[PDB]
Design a protein around this ligand. Structure first.
Ligand SMILES: [K+]
Ligand SMILES: [K+]
Ligand SMILES: [K+]
Ligand SMILES: [Mg+2]
Ligand SMILES: [Mg+2]
Ligand SMILES: [Mg+2]
Ligand SMILES: [Mg+2]
Lengths: 377, 377
């Protein structure tokens, strides 16, 4: 029975995502000199300005001014007529720095409470939901084509929003595609509409899914000329859903950018993606969602629950059992089970933290061992 | 079959929530002089300072400096030894202002795309999930007792986190309670732990739910003396989940504070709470979650889906049908179906947007008419 579901994405250079990227760019830069640095760096971008403010506990010395402008230039906001320019804009900092000064490290208790949810579903090749997958690929392509000379009238900022019609649990096809891209004065809308059809939408949306019925809305308002942080206002942690699973799965509140991995808000969440993906790469279920939660100063999580929503090939009991044998979910264990203390984090900050395979939380190494330990098939 | 679930809350005066409140306090103040004002005001708070920055399109003139300090004082951060003082802290603004200058207004198309999810469940008296309900009531009580002289050693900032054990769909009871409150130098932890037990936890958590087994963690780290924005960093839109359903239900990305009601991110979301609550106040199901989505410049929503997760008392079809007859979900219709253009919004900004009955989205007026129109019982 049919039903339909939607998910959005934005590009690098939508103002919130500018903030996520600059945040994670500081965290990377600090982690490069000091992997054990504890960092929380939040950022606010508005037409003139980038305020990067945080607390950081490190020996590292880094230049927040140049880190900022280099991230703004890579996105490509480089001239006033764009909205915002990486070379003349103001960058202010309010980052306060501290220098660091149980018997088994893994048993160190969790620094801040909370809840994290992870998901995987066999709906795609990457085990992510198809919506959020396609939304990302659309915005991603957009930047590819901007960035690679094909369609050099494109400017950085853009949103995509795919809406899928299922019938139960099978993707049936694509009811609507929204895609709105910022562009120059060169081009008018009919002309933009052929290009975004040819070069962005057509090569990404799978064809059997596209129909005579697919409502497509390329630049519905027309004329998007400006432009990122001019007249809008971006801050880290705002694209929480796009960062995860486009709202196919749940979420406890937490943002990721600018959090170094001691922060469970990030790690528990990466790890939950990792547990659920391995669970389904092993055929124990088809869709799995895990909630983990932690309490301040306790190190074993206060809760684990699994929802395989009717898709099991072993009982939930056996499954919750397996979750605990194969995965060290103590805060410091996460960091080890996934080897986090590395500058891997900027590339996360646009296009989605999950479904992208080459990050340590997307690897399915535990798949087999996991099949075995209750009910090898 | 048992399983357990967790949700957190924070008080007024946790730094993010400080931001939400100041934002909504500007929006209220502007709406009081100009109900049709279009406002998006985002805020950032860090030890010295409050930066309130936005775009606003209004005739109204309001004093952002005094709006800020009055909100900071009501929360109660009033002296340096607290962390932060409403009377000496800096307030900066970067709010850019514009003055305003189809045939049927209701048919005006939606300003920005996206997705919104609303939920209700019969688990409580207010039709909200019990977790997020109790988390809120805990933090809420905390401020009540701070604010009312009972426990005047309390300071503003605090987090609660209830974890519930169900067995399927029935709340069985409460496995753990975390509660951490900022406090003065007066009091030591054993003493704080009796008071927070007597006066905060005991009078709020329902007793049959509390057991010999309930793990309680009052100030687990001990000594929380300071203090809100000192050394942490708050910005609007960060407590997205606590604002909604503590992660029992889904969420498309969007924050609410500082958004005037033309913003679907807020309105579509209030309305979805309203549709789902009426659906269950009428006994058509037990738990309902609605997704609505909108596309830029279209006015009928691009999608509606309903999940009554096996709890129906009429088919989903009949239900999706009823959703469309009883509720005007066009952006401008929402505003009318709920009468939004009123300064009601600051009180929303701490303790949760939903489950609080006296807001127009919590009222169950459509309940009956809704029962009838397919399958009066
Ligand atoms: K952050
Ligand atoms: K958020
Ligand atoms: K906002
Ligand atoms: Mg947190
Ligand atoms: Mg925004
Ligand atoms: Mg939006
Ligand atoms: Mg925070």
């Amino acid at each position: 029975a049919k039903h339909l579901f939607t998910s959005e994405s934005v590009s690098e250079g939508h103002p919130d995502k500018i903030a996520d990227q600059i945040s994670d760019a500081v965290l990377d830069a600090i982690l490069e000199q000091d992997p054990k640095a504890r960092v929380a760096c939040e950022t606010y971008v508005k037409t003139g300005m980038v305020l990067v403010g945080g607390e950081i506990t490190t020996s590292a010395w880094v230049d927040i001014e140049e880190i900022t402008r280099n991230t703004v230039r890579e996105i490509g906001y480089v001239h006033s007529d764009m909205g915002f320019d990486a070379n003349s804009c103001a960058v202010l900092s309010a980052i306060g720095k501290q220098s660091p000064d149980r018997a088994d490290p893994l048993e160190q208790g969790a620094g801040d409470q909370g809840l994290m949810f992870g998901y995987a579903t066999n709906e795609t090749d990457v085990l992510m939901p198809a919506p959020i997958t396609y939304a990302h690929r659309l915005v991603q392509r957009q930047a590819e084509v901007r960035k690679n000379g094909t369609l050099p009238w494109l400017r950085p900022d853009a949103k995509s929003q795919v809406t899928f019609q299922y019938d139960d649990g099978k993707i049936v096809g694509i009811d609507a595609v929204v895609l709105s891209t910022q562009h120059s004065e060169e081009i008018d809308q009919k002309s933009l509409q052929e290009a975004v059809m040819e070069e962005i939408i057509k090569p990404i949306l799978p064809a059997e899914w596209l129909t005579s019925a697919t409502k497509f809305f390329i630049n519905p308002t027309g004329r998007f000329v400006i432009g990122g942080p001019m007249g809008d206002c971006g801050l880290t942690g705002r694209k929480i859903i796009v960062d995860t699973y486009g709202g196919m799965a749940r979420h406890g509140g937490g943002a990721f950018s600018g959090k170094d991995p001691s922060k469970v808000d990030r790690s528990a969440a990466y790890a939950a993606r990792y547990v659920a993906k391995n669970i389904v790469a092993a055929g124990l279920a088809d869709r799995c969602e895990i909630q983990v939660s932690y309490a301040i100063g306790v190190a074993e999580p206060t809760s684990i629950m699994v929802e395989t929503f009717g898709t099991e090939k072993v009982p939930s009991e056996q499954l919750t059992l397996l979750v605990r044998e194969f995965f060290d979910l103590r805060p410091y264990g996460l960091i080890q089970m996934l080897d986090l203390l590395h500058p891997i984090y900027k590339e996360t900050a646009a296009y989605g933290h999950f479904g992208r395979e080459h990050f340590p939380w997307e690897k399915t190494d535990k798949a087999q061992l996991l099949r075995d330990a209750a009910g090898l098939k």
